[PDB]
Swiss-Prot record:
It is found in: Cytoplasm; Nucleus; Endoplasmic reticulum membrane; Cell membrane. Homodimer; disulfide-linked. Forms a trimeric complex with FBXW7 and NOTCH1. Interacts with MAPK3/ERK1, MAPK1/ERK2, MAP2K1/MEK1, MAP2K2/MEK2, NEDD4, NEDD4L, MAPT/TAU, MAPK7, CREB1, SLC9A3R2/NHERF2 and KCNJ1/ROMK1. Associates with the mammalian target of rapamycin complex 2 (mTORC2) via an interaction with MAPKAP1/SIN1. It comes from the Eukaryota. Residues 1-10 have a biased composition (Polar residues). It comes from Homo sapiens (Human). Serine/threonine-protein kinase which is involved in the regulation of a wide variety of ion channels, membrane transporters, cellular enzymes, transcription factors, neuronal excitability, cell growth, proliferation, survival, migration and apoptosis. Plays an important role in cellular stress response. The modification Phosphothreonine is found at T162, T275. Activated by WNK1, WNK2, WNK3 and WNK4; which promote phosphorylation by mTORC2. Expressed in most tissues with highest levels in the pancreas, followed by placenta, kidney and lung. Isoform 2 is strongly expressed in brain and pancreas, weaker in heart, placenta, lung, liver and skeletal muscle. This is Serine/threonine-protein kinase Sgk1. Induction: Induced by a very large spectrum of stimuli distinct from glucocorticoids and serum. These include aldosterone, cell shrinkage, cell swelling, TGF-beta, ischemic injury of the brain, neuronal excitotoxicity memory consolidation, chronic viral hepatitis, DNA-damaging agents, vitamin D3 psychophysiological stress, iron, glucose, EDN1, CSF2, fibroblast growth factor, platelet-derived growth factor, phorbolesters, follicle-stimulating hormone, sorbitol, heat shock, oxidative stress, UV irradiation, and p53/TP53. Its main location: cytoplasm.
Length: 280
C-alpha cells in the first residue's frame, strides 16, 4: 500500500468505471476517458503503474488547477480521478488562429500567473509547465493539469529527439541542471505568452540541440507588432539569469503589478467574473 493522502478512497475500484477511449499518454502514466457506472458522469482518469515509482501526492485546489475528486489503488496500478476538461487544449485553439490578440493572451497569461503565484505561497513549484498541461474548460477558463504528483519520484524516459522535440520550455538553469526554484515557473509563463503572441516558442529551432543553444547563448529578439508593455514583460520574464528575472525578489507581486496586467482585476479573475474572450 502506498500513501495517497486525504483524497484516498479505500472503496473505489476500476470495476466502477466504463473506459471509453485514451485521452493522452504523458511522462507519468496514461490518461483515459471514463464514465462512472453509477454516477453516470464523465471523468478523466490518470493511471500510473506502481512498479514505476522509486509523501507522494499533495493535491491543491484552485479555480485554475484541475480538480482531484478521489484516488484509489489496486495491487499493480494507481488511479487518479480528475475533472474531464472538454474545452480542448489552449494551444489547439492557438494553432487554429496562428496567434492570439493581446487582450486574449493577457487573460490566459493572467489566469496561469495567479495559479503559479498561489502555489509559490504554499511553497510549491510547478517545475515543468507545458502547452500540453494547459487546457480551457467548457466555459473558456484556464485549467492546469497538474494535481500534485511528486514528479521527482517517478521513473520515466526523458530522452530527447534530434529533430522536432516534445514542446516544452526548458529554462537556462534547467539545462545546466540546477535545482528548481519558483523562478523557473516565471520563465515558463513568459515562454507561454511568447508563443501565444508569436506562434512558436522562444528560441525555437527545428533542431533540438540548436534550440537549447539559442536558449543559453542567443539574445532574446522580440519582433514588432506587440505593445511596449508586452515587450517589457517578456524581456523581464525571459531573463536567462534567474537572479535578474522578473519575480526573483518579490515573486507574484512583481508579475501582478506589471504594466501589461494593469487592466487585470485579480480579485475578479480568480472569482471568474471576467468573461473569457473565447467560448469553446
Ligand atoms: O499525462 C500527463 O502526464 C499529463 C496530463 C495530460 C492531460 C491531463 C488531463 C487531465 N484531465 C484532462 N481532461 C481532459 C484532457 C483532454 C485532452 C485532450 C483533449 C482533446 C480534445 C478535447 C478534449 C481533450 C481533453 C486532458 C486531461 C492530465 C495530465
Amino acid at each position: 500500500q502506498i500513501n495517497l493522502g486525504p483524497s484516498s478512497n479505500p472503496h473505489a475500484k476500476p470495476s466502477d468505471f466504463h473506459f471509453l477511449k485514451v485521452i493522452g499518454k504523458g511522462s507519468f502514466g496514461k490518461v483515459l476517458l471514463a464514465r462512472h457506472k453509477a454516477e453516470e458522469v464523465f471523468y478523466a482518469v490518470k493511471v500510473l503503474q506502481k512498479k514505476a515509482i522509486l509523501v507522494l501526492l499533495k493535491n491543491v485546489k484552485h479555480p485554475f488547477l484541475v480538480g482531484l475528486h478521489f484516488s484509489f489503488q489496486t495491487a499493480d496500478k494507481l488511479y487518479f480521478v480528475l475533472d474531464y476538461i472538454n474545452g480542448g487544449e489552449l494551444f489547439y485553439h492557438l494553432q487554429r488562429e496562428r496567434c492570439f490578440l493581446e487582450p486574449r493572451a493577457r487573460f490566459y497569461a493572467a489566469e496561469i500567473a495567479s495559479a503559479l503565484g498561489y502555489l509559490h505561497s504554499l511553497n510549491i513549484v510547478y517545475r515543468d509547465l507545458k502547452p500540453e498541461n494547459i487546457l480551457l474548460d467548457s466555459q473558456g477558463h484556464i485549467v492546469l493539469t497538474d494535481f500534485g504528483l511528486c514528479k521527482e519520484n517517478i521513473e520515466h524516459n526523458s530522452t530527447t529527439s534530434t529533430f522536432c522535440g516534445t514542446p516544452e520550455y526548458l529554462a537556462p538553469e534547467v539545462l545546466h541542471k540546477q535545482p528548481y526554484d519558483r523562478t523557473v515557473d516565471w520563465w515558463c509563463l513568459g515562454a507561454v505568452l511568447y508563443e501565444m503572441l508569436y506562434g512558436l516558442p522562444p528560441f525555437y529551432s527545428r533542431n533540438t540541440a540548436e534550440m537549447y543553444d539559442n536558449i543559453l547563448n542567443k539574445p532574446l529578439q522580440l519582433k514588432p507588432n506587440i505593445t511596449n508593455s508586452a515587450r517589457h514583460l517578456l524581456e523581464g520574464l525571459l531573463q536567462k539569469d534567474r537572479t535578474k528575472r522578473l519575480g526573483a525578489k518579490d515573486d507574484f507581486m512583481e508579475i501582478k503589478s506589471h504594466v501589461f496586467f494593469s487592466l487585470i482585476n485579480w480579485d475578479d479573475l480568480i472569482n471568474k467574473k471576467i468573461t473569457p474572450p473565447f467560448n469553446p
